Design a protein around this nucleic acid. Structure first.
Lengths: 80, 25, 228, 97, 124, 61
RNA sequence: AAAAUGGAUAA
RNA sequence: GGGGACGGGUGAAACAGGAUGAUCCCGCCGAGACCGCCGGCCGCGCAGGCGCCUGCCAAGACCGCCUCUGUCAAUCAAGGGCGAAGGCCGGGGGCUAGAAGGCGAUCAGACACCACCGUAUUCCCGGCCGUAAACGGUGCCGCCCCGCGGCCGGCGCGCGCGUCCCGCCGGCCGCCCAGGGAAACCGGGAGGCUCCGGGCUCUGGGGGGAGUAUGGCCGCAAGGCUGAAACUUGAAGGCAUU
């Protein structure tokens, strides 16, 4: 272990605060949901703090959360 | 309290001073 | 019956002892005996004893199990006198000092509600209920302070549960629920889903409003058990 | 000199605490400078241990126990020996004895 | 049965018996009447003498079951019984008066009205 | 009549001037009551003393 | 429970 | 309604209350205060401070964040607001404590301490006042700084899946590695200084006289803020060790 700040282990940067990284940037990402008529990608904000609606439907796909937004239907990981 | 009693003693002298000034003014 | 048949001085030279009969709800319906000056003067003998309230332990009132009902008292107010034997109806229910002191402990949350429920008879009773929440089984922190959301939930839940376990209940039905401590046990199941609670119990149910002429209720609580 | 870092009180982040009175002196000392030792004892003295229970008619009745916190003032406590004058080294240790 | 109210107050311990309603006193005695020394008035020896003289007055009355409602000066001070509280019970032991529930009945305060001595206390 | 009592065991001296050796006791006529009483002057284990009052024991230990 | 005092000046 | 004798009170007492029935209990009734236990190396507030029940409004940090601008920042004269307690003004209140006042004991004398009684006050609503050992006796932003911790508020990742484990940030704290200092000791600074220099603001210069005098100014007052000199004196004073 003679790791120096120039090259920090990826997990270290992923563990620390997104401003206290040697390279600062977005903690959040885009995570898919599944909807009626869709086996394809339906990307949404991972940390949505606002209502997203079923494409062409009245019901809201993502529940509002201070953190990553939760969902009530089938969902797909990150980007696929 | 010993210093506060000194402050009370000064305030009474200061108050007697203002009544005395009024009598002679 | 210890002064009419006995010799005692001045006040007790002329006195007689009249029985106190508890409601039909209890098992040992004797409360005890009352010294009263015998019928003399403007007042009538059993006309003084009708307004004297008698406080007797539920454990004494129901013989057989003593840890249950041992620390919980029953207030019983004379409401009528039949055959020289005064009869009494519920005047309230009070957990005694030893059983109020035992529950409070350092580190845990305390909940007190004040609830006014009017009986069908016309007795609005102020029901006081105490609750504390301990640890969730094995917990990292010995102190057991919980979230405020699940503190209002305990408080709103108690008022709703108190309505649920005390709907349109007449005094018999109210007393029977305090006879078997059924309501407090229900409180264990209402607040069970949320953070574990302890000592969820009715500390007091004080009669606040009394309708006069409840001889109807007195017969119901003295001899309607045979009908039901 | 600062005999103790807590400065004699447990007041932390508040700047004010609710004030109570010595059971003995009746001196008003804020909750933080208060002895407060919880007391639980049998109401009759343990000398009447079972003499009462043998006298008691009701089966399985346990002697009532008081559960009262006693709140004494610092001045009253040292003279009633509820806590003594500890050594400089001894002061830091807690561990209720 | 009977309720034995022992006010184990400092200055004097009071043993007064009533029977379920609290309006009928079947016997009132107190440690003060039995001792010449005003300071030795709440003492156990006074309690022993005051009771026993009382327990003949409740057997002459005819009762034998006493539930002890022991009390402390309480209110806005005290909350701990004087030495007289046990001694009266020991006098009850001497006659062996069958006993019921012994729940304490000192008046307790829910948010007080404050007590004497100021905020500096009694500077005895 | 005064009761009959002999010390079951011994306890230490009191009063700050000594003198008050404390001793436990038992009653030959009775239940051998194991009450604590105080004595003035020399005592031995199982030695006999006169307990005039009987009804109440003296101060605990 | 009740207890006040002690010259200056060197040692 | 009892019912039957002294009841307080103390260190011991004494003054008061009582056969006009005292103390005591128990059922009331009226009043105002107060929100016990839970009540804390808890939390929240810009401090002072803040703890019954529900309802009601507005508010605040912190965290989360693939939101928005785009230097809008720091710190402060002068000025504006708030500020415990006590005071004071005009209404109210009025339970309890209780400045004054009386009183008992207390001693040489206590007019002090300890009892007993009690007005102002405490309480409330509109005002003033502007002080505190207002304390962490440590200004305000900024940044690096070593391990073991406890609590607390969000906020994540894996484990079996727990109110776990590792923590990520904002605080609340205890021990303390350096290092500093006259030391007590701070060490999330009182460290990174004589190997001295991030910025803004206040404030001191031996000890008395002295927060005194006067000149203002503010206040109904009580007083507050600013603020002397003449004159004196050799020590005053900090932390330590015996």
């Amino acid at each position: 272990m003679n790791v120096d700040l120039l090259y920090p282990d990826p997990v270290e940067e992923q563990r620390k605060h997104k401003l206290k990284r040697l390279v600062q940037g977005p903690n959040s990402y885009f995570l898919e949901i599944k909807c009626a008529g869709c086996q394809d990608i339906v990307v949404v904000y991972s940390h949505a703090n606002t209502p997203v609606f079923c494409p062409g439907c009245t019901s809201q796909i993502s529940i509002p959360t201070g953190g990553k937004c939760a969902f009530t239907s089938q969902v797909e990981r990150y980007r696929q | 309290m010993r210093a506060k009693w000194a402050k009370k003693r000064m305030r009474k002298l200061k108050r007697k001073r203002r009544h005395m000034k009024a009598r002679s003014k | 019956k210890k002064i009419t048949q006995r010799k005692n001085p001045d006040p007790y030279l002329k006195k007689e002892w009249y029985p106190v009969i508890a409601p039909a709800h209890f098992k040992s319906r004797h409360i005890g005996q009352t010294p009263v000056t015998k019928t003399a003067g403007l007042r009538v003998a059993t006309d003084v004893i009708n307004h004297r309230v008698y406080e007797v332990n539920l454990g004494d009132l129901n013989p057989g199990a003593e840890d249950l009902n041992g620390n919980t008292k029953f207030y019983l107010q004379t409401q009528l006198v039949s055959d020289g034997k005064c009869l009494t109806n519920f005047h309230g229910m009070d957990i005694t000092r030893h059983k109020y002191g035992s529950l409070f402990r350092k580190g845990c949350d305390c909940i007190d509600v004040f609830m006014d429920i009017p009986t069908t008879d016309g007795y609005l009773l102020r029901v006081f209920v105490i609750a504390f929440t301990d640890r969730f089984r094995f917990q990292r922190r010995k102190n057991c302070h919980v979230k405020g959301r699940v503190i209002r939930m305990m408080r709103a839940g108690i008022y709703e549960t108190l309505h649920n376990e005390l709907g349109k209940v007449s005094i018999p039905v109210l007393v029977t629920k305090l006879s078997n401590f059924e309501v407090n046990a229900k409180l264990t199941e209402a607040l069970q889903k949320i953070t574990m609670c302890r000592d969820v119990m009715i500390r007091r149910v004080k009669v606040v409003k009394r309708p006069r002429n409840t001889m109807e209720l007195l017969s119901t609580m003295h001899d309607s058990n045979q009908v039901r | 000199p600062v005999k103790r870092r807590n400065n004699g009180r447990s007041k932390y982040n508040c700047g004010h605490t609710n004030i109570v009175r010595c059971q003995n002196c009746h001196r008003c000392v804020p909750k933080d400078k208060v002895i407060k030792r919880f007391t639980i004892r049998n109401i009759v003295d343990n000398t009447i241990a079972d003499d009462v229970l043998n006298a008691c008619v009701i089966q399985g009745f346990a002697i009532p126990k008081l559960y009262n916190k006693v709140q004494y003032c610092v001045s009253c406590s040292i003279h009633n020996h509820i806590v003594r004058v500890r050594s400089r080294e001894d002061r830091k240790i807690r561990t209720p004895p | 049965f009977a309720v034995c109210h022992i006010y184990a107050g400092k200055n004097d311990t009071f043993i007064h018996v009533t029977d379920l309603s609290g309006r009928e006193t079947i016997g009132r005695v107190s440690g003060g009447m039995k001792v010449k020394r005003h300071c030795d008035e709440p003492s156990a020896y006074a309690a022993m003498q005051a009771t026993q003289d009382l327990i003949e007055i409740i057997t002459d009355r005819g009762i034998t079951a006493v539930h002890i409602k022991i009390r402390a000066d309480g209110g806005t001070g005290k909350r701990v019984y004087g030495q007289g509280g046990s001694a009266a019970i020991r006098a009850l032991v001497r006659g062996g008066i069958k006993i019921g529930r012994i729940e304490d009945s000192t008046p307790i305060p829910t948010d007080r009205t404050r007590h004497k001595g100021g905020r500096r206390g009694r500077r005895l | 009549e005064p009761i009959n009592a002999r010390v079951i065991e011994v306890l230490g001296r009191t009063s700050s001037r000594g003198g008050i050796t404390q001793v436990k006791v038992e009653f030959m006529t009775g239940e051998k009551r194991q009450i604590i009483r105080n004595v003035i002057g020399p005592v031995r284990k199982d030695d006999i003393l006169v307990l005039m009052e009987s009804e109440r024991e003296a101060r605990r230990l």
